[PDB]
Amino acid sequence: TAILSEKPNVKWEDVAGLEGAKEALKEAVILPVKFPHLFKGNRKPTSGILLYGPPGTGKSYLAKAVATEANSTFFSVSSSDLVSKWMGESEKLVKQLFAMARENKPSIIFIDQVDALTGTEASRRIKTELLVQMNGVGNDSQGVLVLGATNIPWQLDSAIRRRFERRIYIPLPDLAARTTMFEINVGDTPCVLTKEDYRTLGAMTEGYSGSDIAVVVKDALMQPIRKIQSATHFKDVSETRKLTPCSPGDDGAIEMSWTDIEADELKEPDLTIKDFLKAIKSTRPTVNEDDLLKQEQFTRDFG
């Protein structure tokens, strides 16, 4: 299981925002696949694409969407794992990976953290084997497309860099995308959030990543459970008896614990925007603001 394989089922719409990358990938990858007769002779589809941008944008998830939409098998590998965990057998692994992908066209190879192939003799082999394999466009043949992912494109070996004809920036999510991420992350959970609240949550998380948003949302959803747990005082409201947590000393405030209260006849506190706003304060964004420039320096130079 050093090499993952799957026929993923991620539609474009399942990936929050990124419409620009998406549209780049559509014409870079999907057009060739949709209309292969366009690529007779010396006109050949891209076969290396680098995805670069700050962490927490789900470059992986987007990659699966491409596979789903190209109707191809998704083969994938982590370069950090290759360099550290497997080491000795890494040459063999990079081989087998390209070999599986050839045997399974149409297919996509995903190499995560391509920077981690180069430096801190032994992994010099991995670099070298990868390069030979990406010359496997000039095997015959393909078929197979390599999508590299990096957070630190400026630390990516220029030789490897050069094998990735096409480069696409995966930005931090904008207002609309963050709004979508909040919705997706709560999905079906019982709550009383409006369309406007989602937008508010969106607007209020400038500079957050999908990951960041995921952690904030995971935090917020637990709040009603959190309230039920640490009360101390409940109260009847309203189909026969129904009690919810309330402050010490209130209109009908009995003193008890959740344990004291009967099956069902609990009234969980509503899940409010206020729970999410709280969660936003206690989870700072992950990604430094100087990254914009560092990534944009790369878009300017090797875009």
Curated annotation (Swiss-Prot):
Key words, A-Z: ATP-binding, Endosome, Membrane, Nucleotide-binding, Protein transport, Transport
Annotated region (Disordered), positions in chain: 238-254, 288-303
Predominant place of localization: membrane
Subcellular localization(s) per the UniProt record: Endosome membrane
Membrane topology, record value: Peripheral membrane protein
Binding annotation for ATP: 53-60
Other facts: Present with 5350 molecules/cell in log phase SD medium.
Family, similarity comment: Belongs to the AAA ATPase family.
Protein name in UniProt: Vacuolar protein sorting-associated protein 4
Gene for this chain: VPS4
Residues of the full protein shown: 122 to 433 of 437
